[PDB]
Design an enzyme around this catalytic site. Structure first.
Site, PDB file in Angstrom:
ATOM      1  N   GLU C  71       0.719  -1.335   0.020  1.00 47.20           N
ATOM      2  CA  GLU C  71      -0.041  -0.222   0.079  1.00 47.20           C
ATOM      3  C   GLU C  71       0.858   1.240   0.273  1.00 47.20           C
ATOM      4  O   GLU C  71       2.024   1.449   0.775  1.00 47.20           O
ATOM      5  CB  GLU C  71      -0.914  -0.144   1.220  1.00 47.20           C
ATOM      6  N   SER C 140       7.910  -6.032  10.538  1.00 46.74           N
ATOM      7  CA  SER C 140       7.124  -6.166  11.506  1.00 46.74           C
ATOM      8  C   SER C 140       6.469  -7.680  11.696  1.00 46.74           C
ATOM      9  O   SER C 140       6.257  -8.222  10.741  1.00 46.74           O
ATOM     10  CB  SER C 140       6.025  -5.128  11.894  1.00 46.74           C
ATOM     11  N   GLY C 146       4.216  -7.245   6.842  1.00 46.50           N
ATOM     12  CA  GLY C 146       5.270  -7.425   7.427  1.00 46.50           C
ATOM     13  C   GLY C 146       5.639  -8.843   7.976  1.00 46.50           C
ATOM     14  O   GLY C 146       6.847  -9.270   7.626  1.00 46.50           O
ATOM     15  N   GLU C 183      -2.189  -9.789  15.650  1.00 45.07           N
ATOM     16  CA  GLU C 183      -0.936 -10.000  15.429  1.00 45.07           C
ATOM     17  C   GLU C 183      -0.290 -11.051  16.234  1.00 45.07           C
ATOM     18  O   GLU C 183       0.734 -11.540  15.618  1.00 45.07           O
ATOM     19  CB  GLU C 183      -0.110  -8.695  16.174  1.00 45.07           C
ATOM     20  N   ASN C 206       8.168  -3.710  20.738  1.00 44.92           N
ATOM     21  CA  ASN C 206       7.892  -2.311  20.786  1.00 44.92           C
ATOM     22  C   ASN C 206       7.511  -1.760  22.241  1.00 44.92           C
ATOM     23  O   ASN C 206       7.485  -0.701  22.603  1.00 44.92           O
ATOM     24  CB  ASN C 206       6.645  -2.184  19.925  1.00 44.92           C
ATOM     25  N   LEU C 252      28.580 -10.838   7.387  1.00 43.17           N
ATOM     26  CA  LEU C 252      26.974 -11.404   7.718  1.00 43.17           C
ATOM     27  C   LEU C 252      27.349 -12.703   8.397  1.00 43.17           C
ATOM     28  O   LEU C 252      26.650 -13.123   9.299  1.00 43.17           O
ATOM     29  CB  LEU C 252      26.063 -11.214   6.730  1.00 43.17           C
ATOM     30  N   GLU C 254      29.961 -13.887   9.980  1.00 45.02           N
ATOM     31  CA  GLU C 254      30.524 -13.745  11.242  1.00 45.02           C
ATOM     32  C   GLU C 254      29.439 -13.228  12.378  1.00 45.02           C
ATOM     33  O   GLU C 254      29.628 -13.628  13.598  1.00 45.02           O
ATOM     34  CB  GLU C 254      31.605 -12.534  11.344  1.00 45.02           C
TER      35      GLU C 254
HETATM   36  N1  LIG Z   1       8.775   0.351  16.071  1.00 49.34           N
HETATM   37  C1  LIG Z   1       7.679   0.615  15.157  1.00 49.34           C
HETATM   38  N2  LIG Z   1       6.695  -0.154  15.124  1.00 49.34           N
HETATM   39  C2  LIG Z   1       5.911  -0.096  13.923  1.00 49.34           C
HETATM   40  C3  LIG Z   1       5.687   0.908  13.166  1.00 49.34           C
HETATM   41  N3  LIG Z   1       4.826   0.958  12.303  1.00 49.34           N
HETATM   42  C4  LIG Z   1       3.996  -0.172  12.628  1.00 49.34           C
HETATM   43  N4  LIG Z   1       4.550  -0.813  13.994  1.00 49.34           N
HETATM   44  C5  LIG Z   1       3.878  -1.769  14.501  1.00 49.34           C
HETATM   45  O1  LIG Z   1       3.860  -2.858  13.487  1.00 49.34           O
HETATM   46  C6  LIG Z   1       2.635  -3.856  13.600  1.00 49.34           C
HETATM   47  C7  LIG Z   1       1.728  -3.752  12.648  1.00 49.34           C
HETATM   48  O2  LIG Z   1       2.510  -3.960  11.543  1.00 49.34           O
HETATM   49  P1  LIG Z   1       2.713  -2.730  10.267  1.00 49.34           P
HETATM   50  O3  LIG Z   1       4.123  -2.696   9.517  1.00 49.34           O
HETATM   51  O4  LIG Z   1       2.129  -1.379  10.557  1.00 49.34           O
HETATM   52  O5  LIG Z   1       1.646  -3.319   9.105  1.00 49.34           O
HETATM   53  P2  LIG Z   1       2.102  -3.797   7.550  1.00 49.34           P
HETATM   54  O6  LIG Z   1       3.388  -4.402   7.531  1.00 49.34           O
HETATM   55  O7  LIG Z   1       2.304  -2.472   6.558  1.00 49.34           O
HETATM   56  O8  LIG Z   1       1.072  -4.847   7.063  1.00 49.34           O
HETATM   57  P3  LIG Z   1      -0.435  -4.271   6.448  1.00 49.34           P
HETATM   58  O9  LIG Z   1      -0.717  -2.973   6.733  1.00 49.34           O
HETATM   59  O10 LIG Z   1      -1.352  -5.274   7.259  1.00 49.34           O
HETATM   60  O11 LIG Z   1      -0.564  -4.655   5.073  1.00 49.34           O
HETATM   61  C8  LIG Z   1       2.057  -2.990  14.811  1.00 49.34           C
HETATM   62  O12 LIG Z   1       2.669  -3.852  16.163  1.00 49.34           O
HETATM   63  C9  LIG Z   1       2.940  -1.583  15.138  1.00 49.34           C
HETATM   64  O13 LIG Z   1       3.121  -1.245  16.411  1.00 49.34           O
HETATM   65  C10 LIG Z   1       7.001   1.827  13.311  1.00 49.34           C
HETATM   66  O14 LIG Z   1       7.077   2.623  12.511  1.00 49.34           O
HETATM   67  N5  LIG Z   1       7.989   1.545  14.029  1.00 49.34           N
HETATM   68 MG   LIG Z   2       0.438  -1.412   6.075  1.00 54.06          MG
END
Ligand SMILES: Nc1nc2c(ncn2[C@@H]2O[C@H](COP(=O)(O)OP(=O)(O)OP(=O)(O)O)[C@@H](O)[C@H]2O)c(=O)[nH]1
Ligand SMILES: [Mg+2]
Ligand SMILES: Nc1ncnc2c1ncn2[C@@H]1O[C@H](COP(=O)(O)OP(=O)(O)CP(=O)(O)O)[C@@H](O)[C@H]1O
Ligand SMILES: Nc1nc2c(ncn2[C@@H]2O[C@H](COP(=O)(O)OP(=O)(O)O)[C@@H](O)[C@H]2O)c(=O)[nH]1
Ligand SMILES: COc1ccc2c(c1)NC(=O)CN2c1nc(C)nc2c1CCC2
Ligand SMILES: [Ca+2]
Ligand SMILES: [Mg+2]
EC number: 3.6.5.-
Lengths: 324, 54, 437, 427
Positions: C71, C140, C146, C183, C206, C252, C254
């Site tokens: 997206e 994530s 993620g 999650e 987090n 990497l 190591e």
């Molecule tokens: N540390 C940190 N955590 C993040 C950030 N953005 C999202 N998160 C964490 O990531 C999780 C959600 O995953 P996202 O990365 O936002 O979702 P995505 O990977 O874009 O996947 P979709 O949006 O579902 O398509 C949540 O637990 C958030 O707390 C960030 O900028 N920094």
């Molecule tokens: Mg997203």
């Protein structure tokens, strides 16, 4: 209101702690597996310490110290006293002990052979001389020197053990309950059958002759020591007990302290002591989930709320603090 | 404490200190599972459009 | 010199990649337009920073990075941000609709539509590498992209680059800052599918960095910008040895050698100190002993756990600033006598130490103050399994009722992949306890 | 990510017209479609509900459907009536006579294809279509009968889009005809199968709020729709405005609906306000949190203490301490953890928008997927059975070709829905 859960329903102590907490009107109990608690009265085996302290907006407290089992298991205690320089192998208040795997066998046999030149009575955990019998009985257990000359109360020529209840709060303050109990053997002590040699309550079931429930408390035992031996319980016994409790808990504090942890711990300990005929105190074992005496349940459990629970969750002394 | 393999440069230093000594699936299989799930999706949608046809 | 390609997947991976690459340019002296006056070899070279940057004839220093999101609104801010000139348009890849916090939608449905495009753009960066070591994958656990797409990507990278290392920087889900309730599902699913494809994964809970920002930065409601600037500091500490002259963790491979003796147990715990507020007017600079002692306080770790009730398999100390080996050894000596540091019996009890004299670089106007010396400790302790216990327990609560499972099955996924992924996690937890008890 | 709005029938168009009145004022768009606002937060996500027109006018992506021209001519004469694209007015002449059969099978079938033509033309212009939102009542004939026929046909043409509805439940306290339980039970059967998210707007709950709380002795439909428009604005806040959560319909469904059939949300609002009445004291964050969870603020006449919350969503609007919002929201969950299922960890998510609704400095909107919503369906199932056990008034429906068997099937399915909500009330 504060919230708590109960995960050990066979705990006679914290059953009373739950009633007193509920009767406050500021504590309500949740279901076993409800995560949104303030206080956990957790199980005794595999308590999930790794799940504590991760609920936002909740200060979490638990009635057990993670890692305290190394003081409350017979094999763990002996290894701790030998390997900890704070206590050392030359420790003067712990009997000679060796861990035997059904090990330290060769090192133990050297002491028992050095005991053949001279008394060599030992106990495994049962009681035997010479020692070759107990090894085939063992086939994890720990063998320990049996105290052949214990202090014997009169009338009765009786054996006994001293149980002291100790509470350690979230700040690692060591609180010794001023009330202890003497678990007596109502059978005369025979130096030459284990009903007279073992002072356990369940083993005694001559029971109940000299005091109710084979439980002599501190007031009568103090007066006996005055009338019989011209001393007091404080000077002759309780000083060493406070030293042993202080030394044992100060040793493992770096390993179990929750000072800067995301969750906090307290725990009630049951220290058992032996007194020989020269008024010297010996530590035999520590229990991490002890049961109290009926006469003292109301007072001790109330002191747990005041000192361990309400000190963290306040509302709208029966202990002796051991200083370090 | 042993200090071994000390390497120095102008950016910094590297070393090791010792206190005590000791005592994949194929691309063919990946695509196959990616299309087995797509098959399951098109089946579930076909069952939907069949239900809506009724 | 051997090159490393960074891959940023999902919102968390992209925004953290933003923080890291912003920090890399400040440390290496690279300007937002890609120019680096420090660089005298125009058009190329095999310096240590060329591990992460390529060079054009015009003198621009281009990150060896690719940003992927299903997206576009997050990567679009990279396309118009302060470092818009830094990246080539082809290394910023976006779709139209995201995975909607659904692992199966990101791995199966939408992932299949874009996976071949990403691998082609990834291949374009690898073709400019004379000796590729592998990849650093930022993502994530909780996101649908993620988790879902990264596992699909990690599968294909093992196929296309079999002899290359793959390291992860994974964001462990914390409910305080997440907006998704599923999650735990996405985390277990993506950990199961990625486990055999990842050589070393640095988890960042987090919750840990949130409370560090609250406690030590005096920030009441930390934003992602607060969190990511702290994360990138840790990441830079870990990657500094790949970008600078040194002898510790130079490639990497190591990382796996020094931190991962057991392939499945490849999750080192990161502890960092000091975290000092830039708004603190009067601050007493902490010594080598004080910051090394802080590496053993759970309040400074990337994952809250108790290393006293586990066992160590490896331990690196990465210092940045005014640090000399004499002071490190004196600090280690005093720490060993006062803390519970138990190694497994088949490992030596010791620390590998790396020191970089350049003090930590801070973003101007950020929340972190300039310190004279800092340290990041990488310790592979079995105590990190507490996070798996937490995650698996939440997974168990939901899956017992089959809550939300229909969203995943509706994307082609079979209910069996859930329990298959959970049994792998159950095996991982027992592997940890077997080693640590 | 564009949303296609549809309003069907008398009730659907009146609350739909007031919805577009409320959110056009929030986004600073006048009745002529021109933007005359101050903040650019009003235009960042304006594409979700509006199309950018000639001269950079903003035309709502709205489709107005009815079987009689009466109410729809009232819309075009209304204060914002000229903002709607005139080609999106689709109406017959016969009406439906509060008859679900006329709307779903006979009279509405003649008109549904022309509605889908307008739907299709709005969707082909969409860069990335999220789905659809429908406003309608379940007690009449057009919004209930033809509205569900539309939903079924929209799902056939767009099977991978989110279907969202604002469905007004009938109540004898605000009753037009006796056959409303028939139309509602027939429509709920359709909503269970063919929608992803349904906001249960109970006219019983709207009446009691106007009567017991707002002290209005004889509430009009305007008084009831004032509460609807406030709720509709709140529940769509995180769709229309930028924040830390830029939400969409699919993420909303994925996180709120653990089981596909249980997708009927209790909406709630705070503070409760009556029209034309200005109260000058802003509520504190603790007050907004306590009231938005109060049963007296629920737009569905259900006691939330009779069930358990599966998932919860909350929107705070105004200038306020987001930390205090965190402390107060965490306080409600930790203080009443009995009423949140323990098998969905952290099932409450909150968002904060700086722009408050018109007339209020601070507001809070509550979206709850509670198993207590079965009380609403039980109520309608009882009113249904009282007549159906005597086959009373059924001739109105059999005269349009319907069989008694279809009523038995609808009755069974709603009772099944009640049982399914009861399944997780004890787990
Ligand atoms: N540390 C940190 N955590 C993040 C950030 N953005 C999202 N998160 C964490 O990531 C999780 C959600 O995953 P996202 O990365 O936002 O979702 P995505 O990977 O874009 O996947 P979709 O949006 O579902 O398509 C949540 O637990 C958030 O707390 C960030 O900028 N920094
Ligand atoms: Mg997203
Ligand atoms: N070295 C020793 N010398 C003399 N008596 C000993 C002894 N070791 C144990 N005993 C006796 O054995 C009895 C029981 O021993 P022990 O306390 O280790 O078992 P236990 O753990 O099952 C009871 P508890 O858990 O309540 O302490 C003690 O009360 C004491 O009387
Ligand atoms: N809240 C509210 N309910 C309405 C309104 N108009 C009608 N209703 C309810 O909807 C039902 C009548 O359906 P209606 O929409 O008039 O029939 P239709 O025109 O054929 O769709 C009755 O239960 C009314 O109480 C309105 O403006 N507001
Ligand atoms: C139960 O947990 C939930 C509940 C709801 C959501 C989420 C998680 N997460 C999302 O992304 C969508 N969402 C939302 N959607 C919309 C349209 N308004 C809101 C939320 C949360 C706050 C207001
Ligand atoms: Ca160069
Ligand atoms: Mg009408």
């Amino acid at each position: 209101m504060y919230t708590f859960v109960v995960r050990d329903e066979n705990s006679s102590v914290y059953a009373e702690v739950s009633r007193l907490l509920l009767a406050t009107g500021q504590w309500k109990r949740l279901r076993k597996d409800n995560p949104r608690f303030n206080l956990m009265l957790g199980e005794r085996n595999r308590l999930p310490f790794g799940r504590l302290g991760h609920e936002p907006g909740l200060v979490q407290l638990v009635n057990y110290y993670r890692g305290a089992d190394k003081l409350c298991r017979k094999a763990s205690l002996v290894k701790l006293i030998k390997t900890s320089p704070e206590l050392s192998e030359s420790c003067t208040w712990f009997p000679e002990s060796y861990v035997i795997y059904p090990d330290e066998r060769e090192v133990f046999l050297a002491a028992y052979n050095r005991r053949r030149e001279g008394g060599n009575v030992w106990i495994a955990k049962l009681i035997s001389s010479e020692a070759s019998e107990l090894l085939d009985f063992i086939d994890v257990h720990v063998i320990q020197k049996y105290l052949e000359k214990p202090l014997l109360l009169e009338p009765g020529h009786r054996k006994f053990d001293i149980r002291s209840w100790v509470l350690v709060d979230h700040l690692y303050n060591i609180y010794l309950y001023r009330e202890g109990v003497l678990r007596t053997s109502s059978e005369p002590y025979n130096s030459a059958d284990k009903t007279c040699h073992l002072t356990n309550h369940c083993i005694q079931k001559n029971y109940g002759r000299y005091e109710e429930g084979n439980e002599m408390f501190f007031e009568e035992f103090n007066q006996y020591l005055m009338d019989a031996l011209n001393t007091t319980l404080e000077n002759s016994i309780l000083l060493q007990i406070k030293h042993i409790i202080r030394s044992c808990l100060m040793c493992i504090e770096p390993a179990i302290s929750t000072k800067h942890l995301h969750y906090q711990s307290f725990q009630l300990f049951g220290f058992d002591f032996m007194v020989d005929e020269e008024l010297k105190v010996w530590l035999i074992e520590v229990n991490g989930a002890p049961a109290c005496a009926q006469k003292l349940y109301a007072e001790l459990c109330q002191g747990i709320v005041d000192v361990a629970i309400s000190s963290v969750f306040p509302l709208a002394s029966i202990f002796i603090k051991l200083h370090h | 404490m042993e200090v071994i393999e000390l390497n120095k440069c102008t950016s910094g230093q590297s070393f090791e200190v010792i206190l005590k000594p000791p005592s994949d699936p194929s691309l063919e299989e990946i695509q196959k599972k990616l299309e087995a799930a797509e098959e399951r999706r098109k089946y579930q949608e076909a069952e939907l459009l069949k239900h809506l046809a009724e | 010199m051997r090159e490393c390609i960074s891959i940023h997947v999902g919102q968390a991976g992209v925004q953290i990649g933003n923080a890291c690459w912003e920090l890399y340019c400040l440390e290496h002296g690279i300007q937002p337009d890609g120019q680096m006056p420090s660089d005298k070899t125009i058009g190329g070279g095999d310096d240590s920073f060329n591990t992460f940057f390529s060079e054009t004839g015009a003198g621009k220093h281009v990150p060896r990075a690719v940003f992927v999101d299903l997206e576009p609104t997050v990567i679009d801010e990279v396309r118009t941000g302060t470092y818009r000139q830094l990246f080539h348009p082809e290394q910023l890849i976006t779709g139209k609709e995201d995975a909607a916090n659904n692992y199966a939608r990101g791995h199966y449905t939408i992932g299949k539509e874009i996976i071949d495009l990403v691998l082609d753009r990834i291949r374009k960066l690898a073709d400019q590498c004379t000796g590729l070591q592998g990849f650093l994958v930022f993502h994530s656990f909780g996101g649908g992209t993620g988790s879902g797409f990264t596992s699909l990507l990690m599968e294909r990278l093992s196929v296309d680059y079999g002899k290359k290392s793959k390291l992860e920087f994974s964001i462990y889900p914390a409910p305080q800052v997440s907006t998704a309730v599923v999650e735990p599902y996405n985390s277990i699913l993506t950990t199961h599918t990625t486990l055999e494809h990842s050589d070393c994964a640095f988890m960042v809970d987090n919750e840990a960095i949130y409370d560090i920002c609250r406690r030590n930065l005096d920030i009441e409601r930390p934003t992602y910008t607060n969190l990511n600037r702290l994360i990138s500091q840790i990441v830079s500490s870990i990657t500094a040895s790949l970008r600078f002259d040194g002898a510790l963790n130079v490639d990497l491979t190591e990382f796996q050698t020094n931190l991962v003796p057991y392939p499945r147990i490849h999750f080192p715990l990161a502890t960092y100190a000091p975290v000092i507020s830039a708004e603190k007017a009067y601050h007493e600079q902490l010594s080598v002993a004080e910051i090394t002692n802080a590496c053993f306080e759970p309040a400074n770790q990337m994952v809250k756990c108790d290393p006293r009730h586990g066992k160590y398999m490896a331990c690196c100390l990465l210092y940045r600033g005014d640090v000399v080996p004499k002071d490190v050894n004196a600090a280690i000596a005093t720490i060993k006598t006062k803390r519970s540091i138990q190694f497994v019996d088949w490992c030596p009890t010791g620390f590998k130490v790396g020191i970089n004299y350049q003090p930590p670089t801070v973003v101007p106007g950020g929340d972190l103050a300039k310190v004279q010396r800092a340290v990041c400790m990488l310790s592979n302790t079995t105590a990190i399994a507490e996070a798996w216990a937490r995650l698996d327990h939440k997974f168990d609560l939901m899956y017992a009722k089959r809550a939300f499972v229909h969203w995943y099955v509706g994307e082609g996924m079979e209910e069996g992949e859930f329990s298959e992924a959970r049994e792998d996690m159950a095996a991982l937890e027992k592997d940890y306890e077997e080693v640590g008890v | 990510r564009e949303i296609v709005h549809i309003q069907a029938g008398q009730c659907g168009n009146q609350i739909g017209a007031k919805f577009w009145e409320v959110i056009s004022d929030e986004h600073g768009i006048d009745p002529t479609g021109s933007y005359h606002g101050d903040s650019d937060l009003q235009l960042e996500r304006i594409n979700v509900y509006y199309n950018e027109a000639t001269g950079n006018k903003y035309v709502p992506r709205a489709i107005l459907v009815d079987l009689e021209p009466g109410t729809m001519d009232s819309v075009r004469s209304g204060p914002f009536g000229q903002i709607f694209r005139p080609d999106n007015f689709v109406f017959g002449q016969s009406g439906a006579g509060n008859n679900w059969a006329k709307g779903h099978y006979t009279e509405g079938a003649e008109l549904v294809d022309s509605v889908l033509d307008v739907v299709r033309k709005e969707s082909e212009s969409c860069d990335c279509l999220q789905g659809f939102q429908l406003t309608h009542s379940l007690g009449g004939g057009t919004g209930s009968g033809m509205g569900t026929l539309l939903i079924s046909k929209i799902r056939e043409e767009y099977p991978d889009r989110i279907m969202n509805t604002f469905s007004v439940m009938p109540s004898p306290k605000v009753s037009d005809t006796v056959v409303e339980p028939y139309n509602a039970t027939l429509s709920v059967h359709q909503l269970v199968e063919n929608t992803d998210e349904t906001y249960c707007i109970d006219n019983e709950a709207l009446y009691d709020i106007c009567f017991r709380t707002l002290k209005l002795t004889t509430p009009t439909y305007g008084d009831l729709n004032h509460l609807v428009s406030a709720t509709m604005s709140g529940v769509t806040t995180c769709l229309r405005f930028p924040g830390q959560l830029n939400a969409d319909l699919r993420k909303l469904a994925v996180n709120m609906v653990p089981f596909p059939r249980l997708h009927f949300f209790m909406p709630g609002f705070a503070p409760l306000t009556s029209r034309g009445s200005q109260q000058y004291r802003a509520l504190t964050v603790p007050e907004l949190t306590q009231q938005m969870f109060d049963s007296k603020n629920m737009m569905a006449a259900c006691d939330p203490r009779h069930g358990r919350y599966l998932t919860v969503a909350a929107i705070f609007r105004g200038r306020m301490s987001m930390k205090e919002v965190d402390e107060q929201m965490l306080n409600v969950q930790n203080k009443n953890s009995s009423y949140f299922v323990e098998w969905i960890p952290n099932n409450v998510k909150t968002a904060v928008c700086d722009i408050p609704p018109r007339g209020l400095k601070m507001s809070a909107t509550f979206i709850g997927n509670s198993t207590a919503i079965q009380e609403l369906f039980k109520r309608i199932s009882e009113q249904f059975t009282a007549m159906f056990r005597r086959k009373a008034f059924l001739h109105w429906y059999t005269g349009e070709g319907m069989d008694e068997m279809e009523f038995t099937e609808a009755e069974s399915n709603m009772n099944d829905l009640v049982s399914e909500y009861q399944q997780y009330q004890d787990a």
